Amino acid sequence: ERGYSFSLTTFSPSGKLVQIEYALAAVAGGAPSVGIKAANGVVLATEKKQKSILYDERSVHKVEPITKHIGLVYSGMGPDYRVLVHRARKLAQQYYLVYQEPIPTAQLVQRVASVMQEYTQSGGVRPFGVSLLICGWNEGRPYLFQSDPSGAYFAWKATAMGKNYVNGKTFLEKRYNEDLELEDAIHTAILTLKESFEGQMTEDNIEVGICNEAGFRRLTPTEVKDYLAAIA
Amino acid sequence: TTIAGVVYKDGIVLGADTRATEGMVVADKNCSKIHFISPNIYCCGAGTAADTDMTTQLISSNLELHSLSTGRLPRVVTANRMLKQMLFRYQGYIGAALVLGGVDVTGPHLYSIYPHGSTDKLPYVTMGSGSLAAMAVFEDKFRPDMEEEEAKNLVSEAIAAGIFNDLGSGSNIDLCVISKNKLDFLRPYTVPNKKGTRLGRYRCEKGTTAVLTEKITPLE
Amino acid sequence: TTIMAVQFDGGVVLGADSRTTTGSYIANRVTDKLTPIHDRIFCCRSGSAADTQAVADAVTYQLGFHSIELNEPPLVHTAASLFKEMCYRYREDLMAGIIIAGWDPQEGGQVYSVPMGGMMVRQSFAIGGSGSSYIYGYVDATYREGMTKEECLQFTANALALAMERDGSSGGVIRLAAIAESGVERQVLLG
Amino acid sequence: SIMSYNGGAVMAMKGKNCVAIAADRRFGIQAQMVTTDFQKIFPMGDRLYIGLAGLATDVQTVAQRLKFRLNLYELKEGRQIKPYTLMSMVANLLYEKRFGPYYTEPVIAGLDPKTFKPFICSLDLIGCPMVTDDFVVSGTCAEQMYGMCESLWEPNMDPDHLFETISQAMLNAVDRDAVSGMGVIVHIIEKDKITTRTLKARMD
Amino acid sequence: VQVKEQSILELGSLLAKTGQAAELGGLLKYVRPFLNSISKAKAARLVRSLLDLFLDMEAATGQEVELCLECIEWAKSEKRTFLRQALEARLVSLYFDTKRYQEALHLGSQLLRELKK
Amino acid sequence: TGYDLSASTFSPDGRVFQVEYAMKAVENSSTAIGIRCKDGVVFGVEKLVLSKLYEEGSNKRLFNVDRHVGMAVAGLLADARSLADIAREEASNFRSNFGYNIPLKHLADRVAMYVHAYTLYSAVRPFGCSFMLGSYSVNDGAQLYMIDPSGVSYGYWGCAIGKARQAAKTEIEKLQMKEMTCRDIVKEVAKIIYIVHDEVKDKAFELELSWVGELTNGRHEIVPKDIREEAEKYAKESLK
Amino acid sequence: SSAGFDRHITIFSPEGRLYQVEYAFKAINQGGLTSVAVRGKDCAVIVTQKKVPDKLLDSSTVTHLFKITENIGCVMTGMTADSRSQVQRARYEAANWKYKYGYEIPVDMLCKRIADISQVYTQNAEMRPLGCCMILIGIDEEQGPQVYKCDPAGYYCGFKATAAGVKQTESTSFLEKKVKKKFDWTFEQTVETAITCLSTVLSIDFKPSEIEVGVVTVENPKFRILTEAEIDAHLVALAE
């Protein structure tokens, strides 16, 4: 490059930022996803489709692990997702080289959102088009956080993103209670993902990852075929 | 410091003592010199203490980073290639005499790494101060394709020769067996040397020490 | 350490000992002194151990990329140039003696010598290493121009056996390799 | 030597549900004392201390740099620091100065912030984290301190006999040393409270 | 554990195919504590499937409505939402098989006060 | 319009007009052909003289990159002398690292990457040049290559650059290519330059011929031009 | 609609889209070419025609079938100048996997490294996003054959049989009808379907001179470009 470095995101005359609001529009028209925190573990459930019978499902993965106990899904766009995965992978290593201890889940999200915000103020680039759902069972209590293209973190009990997320939002508002078990959380997570799905819900149309206090665990399609018997 | 390692018909047996001397004074009666790299690869270190620590944590970081990206399994030749390329870059100013061993998809592999960067692929290696004593037991007693109990008897014999015939090795024996599926890690394996008991009460009554100024600060 | 390379009417014949010392102690009884760079081009390294392993990887990297791009089997003289460029540039930091020998489709069998200064010269036969000073007289009275392959295998076998006997730093076992148009024939002897 | 330029002695001993730490009180230049109240034990929170010995420059510098990283750590998080994390933090700070190191040998002794479990460790001048279960020593008069604690240590010790043991350990080891002395301070900490006593030593 | 699961499911499928309800309904009364061995959402499909194989034997309504009230009052004690809803939906289907008049409609009004809520 | 200012933007249907604009800049230049016979490559450039306007032998477009490599540039002449410095500099570093002569397949690739690199950014513009690469080697025969301003570079037997592009290669393919000595090809080149470009716009024009092959031992040089001069004597035999 | 400069640089639209990248998807179709990839049970076929407009042009320097490593081949569609720049990146990072890691790179891991680079070109606004596609084949240990496709947006996935180029929606519609009927796939069963799909979509019924076949096999993992004779051998064999 040359030395331009001019930020292409400035304030509106109203006083809002324009490109971040447009980046949120790309997230809302993405694949639906749901995450539920249920007092012994946290369950991530995304919704994976294939436009043909020609694609392969053992290749592209949505639920992606980070350390040994920290999972991560998204709802926005695809190529930008893999960037900040590899960024967060290295970002958890400088914690572990220095402190010799697995990084707490709150400590990642402070660092990932700091990457993402500082990315928007600098010049020549667009913001990301990805929102995240990060979870983990650190120090007894499990956790569930959500980031955004603006770079703001939250702490949900149960949220949803992607298409028709407000419909899934009201559904969890009646479905979720003070506490459940892990298996009940999986049963209501498939229930809310079956809200806006299509007719074929096989072991390949959904893709589910959990966080035990024993650790992160990604579910193979065998159990998801077995657990979808009398689903929702 | 005395480390060794051998390849039997299925897996790999590693072994070390537990003693870190500082000059000519025993600074640690129980150290830990078998390090983690991956769920199928361990490593043993010798020479400088801190330089083997910070190196073997860096490579265990990168292979965890690599294998989580590929999603398959680490390989021992990858751990060999990262180490010899790093140590050669620092011109041998980092004292790290390693023994690398693990079981891949291909099979068991054993490596000796010198701190200038030269590496070897051997069926049995010894490093450290009491390495010349340990190589005497390996060469007099070795056959290809041993059993697991034959190998575990052999390495503990070689480490015990390093203890009883050298001043840098003086304590408990560690082992580690890495087969194709089983990972055994035995920190007390053999205690050859005890400590003699005390025959005299030396404790005086409480208040046998003159105190100038005391101070109490309560906590929560 | 003693390395050996003799060319003949077809390809070449390489040979080395296997004994790695750390000054008076044998750190390794058996050592692959010789290294496959490409499918028809070997080298056989001497001097330091960490240095020569470092150079032989980088040359294998650069020649491998160059030959895929050119989509042909490379030249032995091309590979000999790459050892020259590194060992001359870092002649203050490398103690390496390399003999490159390999078969080539353009020019048959070739043997080059890159000693510790960083020069390069084609020879009919070429020796090197710490034990190579003891067989100068034998290799000059026994070499005859126009040998077959099996004569060269017998020639390098007697030449390495003398230096292993007389030098202390050389010994172990003998590794041989015959590179030709057909294949690479590798064997391990004693005697 | 460079370690023998100012002198020093730091001992930490593990008790039953408590841990004690001690140091001497001398600041001098190779034969000539200057003051009698040089601080070598620094607080790093509650029920978690650190002692430093060696060169008096690197005693003061590293104790400030460690406090710099520690106050940032407890603000970016909500909790206090675990004693393993402090040991990894110090071993990072020493290994960064790999070629020209800080001439010091830190000794960490604290309790659990979650329970009362005691912890002791000591490091090299380049950061080898050696932990023990009985005692750690550091300083110029190191071998005399091994003469005491190998001979005077029992597993399950109330804080009374823990105080009486570490006091007789320091007073006999330091008074054999030439460049250490001029008073001994002892911090004995536990779950309830913290006791600081200053012993009666030879002032020569 | 699992070898006793497939042995009683073998015997449970045996009692259905032959055609006796005393041996089968005795088994359904027996396996009531065994429901607290598996997932609370996987158990309900099994209870549904065992109830259907109980019903599709012979029109003997002396005990069919009696086993239903046992399971509902068991779910009133055990407090599962999906279980009691699965039992009510079968029970009102049973009443329409018997052509009942108000108590079918009374019950169906009671569920809609909860189901759509 | 609106999309045709930078080399970084695409069109709404998906092309780049700045490359499209530079292609027709080369098209408005004089004619240069290149043809290989069975043991060499012959270059031919029609070169215009306005009235006097220079010497006899200024600003020749037959550059000489390597000892065995030729050029036949046409287009914007200032940028052509830049590529000749780049292609010269590339072959030298091949000689330095390696130490056999540069193959022509690489030298087409290594140059065309540098052409392609100027078609990405809004800082620089595309080159307005196009040219021929001719070599000969006893291990590889003769090869003839051809680079456009986009960077698309591959092999030909006969090509032609300039205004007379489709009009010149109409009759190149009428000849033979394998059954020809290049000395026969030399006078065959000169008629095609003499056939095309009637002197309606430009009265005076030169004819520079260059010639690498078996007879020149792989060394590239100009033809003996004032010597023996058999091209133009044979070329003007086509008055009817 | 258009806000700011969303038609020009890679920023967002008010509709939550962008436009430069989806212009680049139909920057392939100016190439005018269609390539088909089919994976069988123990093989992986790549088939691609070529158009030879000039008789004065070689039949050697044209074919898009490239060789990344000894066990990985590819095919390129889109424009040609952007294609060969993409291939040198793939050749370069395959070799760095050897030097860093020691073993041969998987065909899956290479598509991550390519799609990351195409991501960044989308990402920073002052550079062009390189419109050309990418299809790889190769044999993995304990995984069999694989077929992947990098895209100029920056995403990839595995496939069983998937074409690219100009004609996909007729070519993929035929391959779905071929796969979902659950037939056998051995070697020549896989090659014949890769021809007849490209035969029926293009509706040509050609002479064995335009297409090239780049099969890799479990028994022979070397990337191999088929001879024109044996290409004719398969074509008359499936002919009844």
Side-chain angles (χ1 to χ4, degrees), chain B residues 84 88 114 116-120 122 124 132 135 139, chain C residues 25 27-31 49-51 53-54 57 94:
Chain B
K84 73 172 78 177
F88 179 73
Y114 296 102
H116 290 283
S118 64
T119 62
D120 286 324
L122 290 176
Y124 59 96
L132 303 181
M135 188 58 70
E139 183 61 35
Chain C
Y25 172 69
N28 194 1
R29 283 82 178 264
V30 42
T31 302
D51 292 333
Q53 290 179 358
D57 292 333
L94 296 178

PDB file of all heavy atoms in Angstrom, chain B residues 84 88 114 116-120 122 124 132 135 139, chain C residues 25 27-31 49-51 53-54 57 94:
ATOM      1  N   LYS B  84      14.681 -28.673  15.537  1.00  0.00           N
ATOM      2  CA  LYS B  84      16.014 -28.486  14.982  1.00  0.00           C
ATOM      3  C   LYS B  84      16.108 -27.185  14.205  1.00  0.00           C
ATOM      4  O   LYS B  84      17.202 -26.641  14.043  1.00  0.00           O
ATOM      5  CB  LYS B  84      16.412 -29.656  14.085  1.00  0.00           C
ATOM      6  CG  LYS B  84      15.716 -29.694  12.753  1.00  0.00           C
ATOM      7  CD  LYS B  84      16.303 -30.750  11.866  1.00  0.00           C
ATOM      8  CE  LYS B  84      15.811 -32.106  12.245  1.00  0.00           C
ATOM      9  NZ  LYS B  84      16.334 -33.134  11.313  1.00  0.00           N
ATOM     10  N   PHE B  88      18.905 -24.353  15.747  1.00  0.00           N
ATOM     11  CA  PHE B  88      19.950 -23.910  14.840  1.00  0.00           C
ATOM     12  C   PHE B  88      19.915 -22.407  14.633  1.00  0.00           C
ATOM     13  O   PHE B  88      20.956 -21.797  14.372  1.00  0.00           O
ATOM     14  CB  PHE B  88      19.815 -24.630  13.504  1.00  0.00           C
ATOM     15  CG  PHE B  88      20.840 -24.227  12.508  1.00  0.00           C
ATOM     16  CD1 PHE B  88      22.144 -24.646  12.644  1.00  0.00           C
ATOM     17  CD2 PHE B  88      20.505 -23.418  11.445  1.00  0.00           C
ATOM     18  CE1 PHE B  88      23.094 -24.270  11.735  1.00  0.00           C
ATOM     19  CE2 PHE B  88      21.452 -23.038  10.535  1.00  0.00           C
ATOM     20  CZ  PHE B  88      22.748 -23.465  10.680  1.00  0.00           C
ATOM     21  N   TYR B 114      20.560 -32.485  19.697  1.00  0.00           N
ATOM     22  CA  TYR B 114      21.662 -31.787  20.328  1.00  0.00           C
ATOM     23  C   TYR B 114      21.450 -30.277  20.228  1.00  0.00           C
ATOM     24  O   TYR B 114      20.821 -29.801  19.281  1.00  0.00           O
ATOM     25  CB  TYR B 114      22.961 -32.207  19.665  1.00  0.00           C
ATOM     26  CG  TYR B 114      23.217 -33.659  19.896  1.00  0.00           C
ATOM     27  CD1 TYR B 114      22.969 -34.590  18.904  1.00  0.00           C
ATOM     28  CD2 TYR B 114      23.678 -34.104  21.120  1.00  0.00           C
ATOM     29  CE1 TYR B 114      23.188 -35.922  19.120  1.00  0.00           C
ATOM     30  CE2 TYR B 114      23.900 -35.431  21.347  1.00  0.00           C
ATOM     31  CZ  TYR B 114      23.653 -36.338  20.345  1.00  0.00           C
ATOM     32  OH  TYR B 114      23.876 -37.674  20.568  1.00  0.00           O
ATOM     33  N   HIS B 116      22.993 -27.758  19.228  1.00  0.00           N
ATOM     34  CA  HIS B 116      23.361 -26.997  18.042  1.00  0.00           C
ATOM     35  C   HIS B 116      22.397 -27.244  16.894  1.00  0.00           C
ATOM     36  O   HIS B 116      22.353 -26.452  15.949  1.00  0.00           O
ATOM     37  CB  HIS B 116      24.783 -27.328  17.629  1.00  0.00           C
ATOM     38  CG  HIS B 116      25.809 -26.804  18.575  1.00  0.00           C
ATOM     39  ND1 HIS B 116      26.186 -25.480  18.599  1.00  0.00           N
ATOM     40  CD2 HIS B 116      26.519 -27.415  19.549  1.00  0.00           C
ATOM     41  CE1 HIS B 116      27.096 -25.301  19.537  1.00  0.00           C
ATOM     42  NE2 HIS B 116      27.316 -26.459  20.130  1.00  0.00           N
ATOM     43  N   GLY B 117      21.628 -28.324  16.947  1.00  0.00           N
ATOM     44  CA  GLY B 117      20.641 -28.564  15.918  1.00  0.00           C
ATOM     45  C   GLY B 117      20.750 -29.914  15.245  1.00  0.00           C
ATOM     46  O   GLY B 117      19.900 -30.273  14.429  1.00  0.00           O
ATOM     47  N   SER B 118      21.790 -30.670  15.564  1.00  0.00           N
ATOM     48  CA  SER B 118      21.975 -31.971  14.943  1.00  0.00           C
ATOM     49  C   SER B 118      21.067 -32.996  15.600  1.00  0.00           C
ATOM     50  O   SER B 118      21.006 -33.087  16.829  1.00  0.00           O
ATOM     51  CB  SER B 118      23.428 -32.402  15.062  1.00  0.00           C
ATOM     52  OG  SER B 118      23.774 -32.586  16.419  1.00  0.00           O
ATOM     53  N   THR B 119      20.352 -33.766  14.784  1.00  0.00           N
ATOM     54  CA  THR B 119      19.378 -34.729  15.276  1.00  0.00           C
ATOM     55  C   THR B 119      19.674 -36.106  14.709  1.00  0.00           C
ATOM     56  O   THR B 119      20.322 -36.227  13.668  1.00  0.00           O
ATOM     57  CB  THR B 119      17.962 -34.349  14.890  1.00  0.00           C
ATOM     58  OG1 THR B 119      17.866 -34.335  13.463  1.00  0.00           O
ATOM     59  CG2 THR B 119      17.596 -32.982  15.428  1.00  0.00           C
ATOM     60  N   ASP B 120      19.171 -37.137  15.385  1.00  0.00           N
ATOM     61  CA  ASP B 120      19.387 -38.526  15.002  1.00  0.00           C
ATOM     62  C   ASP B 120      18.118 -39.335  15.216  1.00  0.00           C
ATOM     63  O   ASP B 120      17.341 -39.076  16.133  1.00  0.00           O
ATOM     64  CB  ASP B 120      20.524 -39.142  15.815  1.00  0.00           C
ATOM     65  CG  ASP B 120      21.879 -38.644  15.385  1.00  0.00           C
ATOM     66  OD1 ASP B 120      22.076 -38.426  14.176  1.00  0.00           O
ATOM     67  OD2 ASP B 120      22.746 -38.454  16.259  1.00  0.00           O
ATOM     68  N   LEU B 122      17.219 -43.065  16.170  1.00  0.00           N
ATOM     69  CA  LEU B 122      17.878 -44.251  16.684  1.00  0.00           C
ATOM     70  C   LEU B 122      16.880 -45.143  17.401  1.00  0.00           C
ATOM     71  O   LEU B 122      15.810 -44.677  17.797  1.00  0.00           O
ATOM     72  CB  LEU B 122      19.012 -43.853  17.638  1.00  0.00           C
ATOM     73  CG  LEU B 122      20.207 -43.204  16.950  1.00  0.00           C
ATOM     74  CD1 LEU B 122      21.234 -42.757  17.952  1.00  0.00           C
ATOM     75  CD2 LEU B 122      20.800 -44.180  15.965  1.00  0.00           C
ATOM     76  N   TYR B 124      17.570 -46.548  20.329  1.00  0.00           N
ATOM     77  CA  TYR B 124      17.759 -46.304  21.752  1.00  0.00           C
ATOM     78  C   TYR B 124      18.801 -45.214  21.933  1.00  0.00           C
ATOM     79  O   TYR B 124      19.831 -45.227  21.259  1.00  0.00           O
ATOM     80  CB  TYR B 124      18.175 -47.582  22.485  1.00  0.00           C
ATOM     81  CG  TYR B 124      19.447 -48.229  22.002  1.00  0.00           C
ATOM     82  CD1 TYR B 124      20.658 -47.981  22.625  1.00  0.00           C
ATOM     83  CD2 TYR B 124      19.429 -49.132  20.952  1.00  0.00           C
ATOM     84  CE1 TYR B 124      21.820 -48.580  22.191  1.00  0.00           C
ATOM     85  CE2 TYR B 124      20.586 -49.738  20.514  1.00  0.00           C
ATOM     86  CZ  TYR B 124      21.776 -49.458  21.138  1.00  0.00           C
ATOM     87  OH  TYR B 124      22.930 -50.061  20.709  1.00  0.00           O
ATOM     88  N   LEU B 132      26.820 -41.880  29.808  1.00  0.00           N
ATOM     89  CA  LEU B 132      27.774 -42.903  29.410  1.00  0.00           C
ATOM     90  C   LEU B 132      27.556 -44.177  30.205  1.00  0.00           C
ATOM     91  O   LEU B 132      27.756 -45.280  29.688  1.00  0.00           O
ATOM     92  CB  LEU B 132      29.196 -42.395  29.594  1.00  0.00           C
ATOM     93  CG  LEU B 132      29.541 -41.109  28.846  1.00  0.00           C
ATOM     94  CD1 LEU B 132      30.986 -40.737  29.088  1.00  0.00           C
ATOM     95  CD2 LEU B 132      29.246 -41.176  27.388  1.00  0.00           C
ATOM     96  N   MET B 135      24.384 -45.891  28.635  1.00  0.00           N
ATOM     97  CA  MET B 135      24.595 -46.528  27.342  1.00  0.00           C
ATOM     98  C   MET B 135      25.277 -47.880  27.505  1.00  0.00           C
ATOM     99  O   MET B 135      25.140 -48.763  26.651  1.00  0.00           O
ATOM    100  CB  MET B 135      25.404 -45.599  26.441  1.00  0.00           C
ATOM    101  CG  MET B 135      25.544 -46.046  25.003  1.00  0.00           C
ATOM    102  SD  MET B 135      23.956 -46.260  24.188  1.00  0.00           S
ATOM    103  CE  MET B 135      23.412 -44.566  24.051  1.00  0.00           C
ATOM    104  N   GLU B 139      23.745 -51.227  25.665  1.00  0.00           N
ATOM    105  CA  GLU B 139      24.448 -51.979  24.643  1.00  0.00           C
ATOM    106  C   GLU B 139      24.706 -53.416  25.071  1.00  0.00           C
ATOM    107  O   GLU B 139      24.546 -54.340  24.263  1.00  0.00           O
ATOM    108  CB  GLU B 139      25.743 -51.277  24.277  1.00  0.00           C
ATOM    109  CG  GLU B 139      26.426 -51.993  23.177  1.00  0.00           C
ATOM    110  CD  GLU B 139      25.592 -52.037  21.904  1.00  0.00           C
ATOM    111  OE1 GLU B 139      24.861 -51.069  21.597  1.00  0.00           O
ATOM    112  OE2 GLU B 139      25.640 -53.074  21.214  1.00  0.00           O
TER     113      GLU B 139
ATOM    114  N   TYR C  25      34.092 -39.849  22.147  1.00  0.00           N
ATOM    115  CA  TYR C  25      32.988 -40.744  22.420  1.00  0.00           C
ATOM    116  C   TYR C  25      32.129 -40.881  21.178  1.00  0.00           C
ATOM    117  O   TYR C  25      31.867 -39.901  20.478  1.00  0.00           O
ATOM    118  CB  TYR C  25      32.154 -40.233  23.587  1.00  0.00           C
ATOM    119  CG  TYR C  25      30.889 -41.008  23.792  1.00  0.00           C
ATOM    120  CD1 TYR C  25      30.927 -42.314  24.246  1.00  0.00           C
ATOM    121  CD2 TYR C  25      29.657 -40.436  23.531  1.00  0.00           C
ATOM    122  CE1 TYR C  25      29.770 -43.030  24.428  1.00  0.00           C
ATOM    123  CE2 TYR C  25      28.500 -41.143  23.714  1.00  0.00           C
ATOM    124  CZ  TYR C  25      28.561 -42.437  24.164  1.00  0.00           C
ATOM    125  OH  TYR C  25      27.400 -43.148  24.347  1.00  0.00           O
ATOM    126  N   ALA C  27      28.930 -40.932  19.563  1.00  0.00           N
ATOM    127  CA  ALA C  27      27.540 -40.608  19.825  1.00  0.00           C
ATOM    128  C   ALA C  27      26.604 -41.457  18.986  1.00  0.00           C
ATOM    129  O   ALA C  27      25.436 -41.622  19.346  1.00  0.00           O
ATOM    130  CB  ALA C  27      27.282 -39.127  19.570  1.00  0.00           C
ATOM    131  N   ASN C  28      27.098 -42.022  17.892  1.00  0.00           N
ATOM    132  CA  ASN C  28      26.250 -42.789  16.998  1.00  0.00           C
ATOM    133  C   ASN C  28      27.117 -43.751  16.207  1.00  0.00           C
ATOM    134  O   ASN C  28      28.047 -43.340  15.511  1.00  0.00           O
ATOM    135  CB  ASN C  28      25.479 -41.870  16.057  1.00  0.00           C
ATOM    136  CG  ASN C  28      24.355 -42.574  15.361  1.00  0.00           C
ATOM    137  OD1 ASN C  28      24.120 -43.760  15.577  1.00  0.00           O
ATOM    138  ND2 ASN C  28      23.643 -41.848  14.512  1.00  0.00           N
ATOM    139  N   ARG C  29      26.789 -45.035  16.315  1.00  0.00           N
ATOM    140  CA  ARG C  29      27.518 -46.088  15.621  1.00  0.00           C
ATOM    141  C   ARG C  29      27.260 -46.039  14.136  1.00  0.00           C
ATOM    142  O   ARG C  29      28.172 -46.253  13.336  1.00  0.00           O
ATOM    143  CB  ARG C  29      27.089 -47.483  16.096  1.00  0.00           C
ATOM    144  CG  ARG C  29      27.616 -47.975  17.413  1.00  0.00           C
ATOM    145  CD  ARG C  29      26.780 -47.413  18.504  1.00  0.00           C
ATOM    146  NE  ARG C  29      27.174 -47.857  19.816  1.00  0.00           N
ATOM    147  CZ  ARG C  29      26.628 -48.869  20.465  1.00  0.00           C
ATOM    148  NH1 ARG C  29      25.656 -49.565  19.900  1.00  0.00           N
ATOM    149  NH2 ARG C  29      27.055 -49.163  21.681  1.00  0.00           N
ATOM    150  N   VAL C  30      26.008 -45.802  13.772  1.00  0.00           N
ATOM    151  CA  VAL C  30      25.533 -45.914  12.406  1.00  0.00           C
ATOM    152  C   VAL C  30      24.832 -44.625  12.012  1.00  0.00           C
ATOM    153  O   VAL C  30      23.899 -44.184  12.685  1.00  0.00           O
ATOM    154  CB  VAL C  30      24.641 -47.150  12.240  1.00  0.00           C
ATOM    155  CG1 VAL C  30      23.697 -47.300  13.414  1.00  0.00           C
ATOM    156  CG2 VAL C  30      23.839 -47.040  10.963  1.00  0.00           C
ATOM    157  N   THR C  31      25.290 -44.021  10.925  1.00  0.00           N
ATOM    158  CA  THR C  31      24.797 -42.717  10.525  1.00  0.00           C
ATOM    159  C   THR C  31      24.625 -42.686   9.016  1.00  0.00           C
ATOM    160  O   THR C  31      25.510 -43.134   8.282  1.00  0.00           O
ATOM    161  CB  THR C  31      25.769 -41.623  10.975  1.00  0.00           C
ATOM    162  OG1 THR C  31      25.918 -41.694  12.398  1.00  0.00           O
ATOM    163  CG2 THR C  31      25.249 -40.257  10.621  1.00  0.00           C
ATOM    164  N   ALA C  49      27.817 -31.218  12.023  1.00  0.00           N
ATOM    165  CA  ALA C  49      26.649 -32.070  11.891  1.00  0.00           C
ATOM    166  C   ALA C  49      25.403 -31.212  11.828  1.00  0.00           C
ATOM    167  O   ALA C  49      24.534 -31.434  10.983  1.00  0.00           O
ATOM    168  CB  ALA C  49      26.566 -33.057  13.050  1.00  0.00           C
ATOM    169  N   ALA C  50      25.310 -30.232  12.723  1.00  0.00           N
ATOM    170  CA  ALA C  50      24.170 -29.327  12.706  1.00  0.00           C
ATOM    171  C   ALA C  50      24.194 -28.436  11.477  1.00  0.00           C
ATOM    172  O   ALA C  50      23.140 -28.063  10.956  1.00  0.00           O
ATOM    173  CB  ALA C  50      24.154 -28.481  13.975  1.00  0.00           C
ATOM    174  N   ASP C  51      25.388 -28.097  10.993  1.00  0.00           N
ATOM    175  CA  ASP C  51      25.488 -27.207   9.845  1.00  0.00           C
ATOM    176  C   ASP C  51      25.095 -27.911   8.560  1.00  0.00           C
ATOM    177  O   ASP C  51      24.326 -27.373   7.758  1.00  0.00           O
ATOM    178  CB  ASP C  51      26.906 -26.664   9.727  1.00  0.00           C
ATOM    179  CG  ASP C  51      27.257 -25.729  10.846  1.00  0.00           C
ATOM    180  OD1 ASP C  51      26.335 -25.102  11.401  1.00  0.00           O
ATOM    181  OD2 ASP C  51      28.455 -25.611  11.166  1.00  0.00           O
ATOM    182  N   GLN C  53      23.343 -30.631   8.089  1.00  0.00           N
ATOM    183  CA  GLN C  53      21.928 -30.972   8.039  1.00  0.00           C
ATOM    184  C   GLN C  53      21.083 -29.747   7.738  1.00  0.00           C
ATOM    185  O   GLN C  53      20.010 -29.860   7.140  1.00  0.00           O
ATOM    186  CB  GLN C  53      21.483 -31.606   9.347  1.00  0.00           C
ATOM    187  CG  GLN C  53      22.027 -32.985   9.579  1.00  0.00           C
ATOM    188  CD  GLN C  53      21.566 -33.552  10.894  1.00  0.00           C
ATOM    189  OE1 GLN C  53      20.862 -32.891  11.651  1.00  0.00           O
ATOM    190  NE2 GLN C  53      21.967 -34.779  11.180  1.00  0.00           N
ATOM    191  N   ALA C  54      21.546 -28.568   8.147  1.00  0.00           N
ATOM    192  CA  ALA C  54      20.785 -27.353   7.893  1.00  0.00           C
ATOM    193  C   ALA C  54      20.853 -26.962   6.426  1.00  0.00           C
ATOM    194  O   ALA C  54      19.855 -26.530   5.840  1.00  0.00           O
ATOM    195  CB  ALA C  54      21.308 -26.223   8.772  1.00  0.00           C
ATOM    196  N   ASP C  57      18.865 -29.387   3.923  1.00  0.00           N
ATOM    197  CA  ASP C  57      17.422 -29.217   3.880  1.00  0.00           C
ATOM    198  C   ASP C  57      17.034 -28.039   3.003  1.00  0.00           C
ATOM    199  O   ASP C  57      16.059 -28.117   2.250  1.00  0.00           O
ATOM    200  CB  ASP C  57      16.881 -29.034   5.288  1.00  0.00           C
ATOM    201  CG  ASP C  57      17.019 -30.280   6.113  1.00  0.00           C
ATOM    202  OD1 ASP C  57      17.040 -31.374   5.513  1.00  0.00           O
ATOM    203  OD2 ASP C  57      17.101 -30.173   7.354  1.00  0.00           O
ATOM    204  N   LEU C  94      30.064 -21.529   8.617  1.00  0.00           N
ATOM    205  CA  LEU C  94      29.799 -22.915   8.272  1.00  0.00           C
ATOM    206  C   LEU C  94      31.109 -23.656   8.097  1.00  0.00           C
ATOM    207  O   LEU C  94      32.013 -23.174   7.409  1.00  0.00           O
ATOM    208  CB  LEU C  94      28.973 -23.015   6.992  1.00  0.00           C
ATOM    209  CG  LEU C  94      27.573 -22.421   7.086  1.00  0.00           C
ATOM    210  CD1 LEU C  94      26.847 -22.529   5.761  1.00  0.00           C
ATOM    211  CD2 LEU C  94      26.793 -23.092   8.196  1.00  0.00           C
TER     212      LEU C  94
END
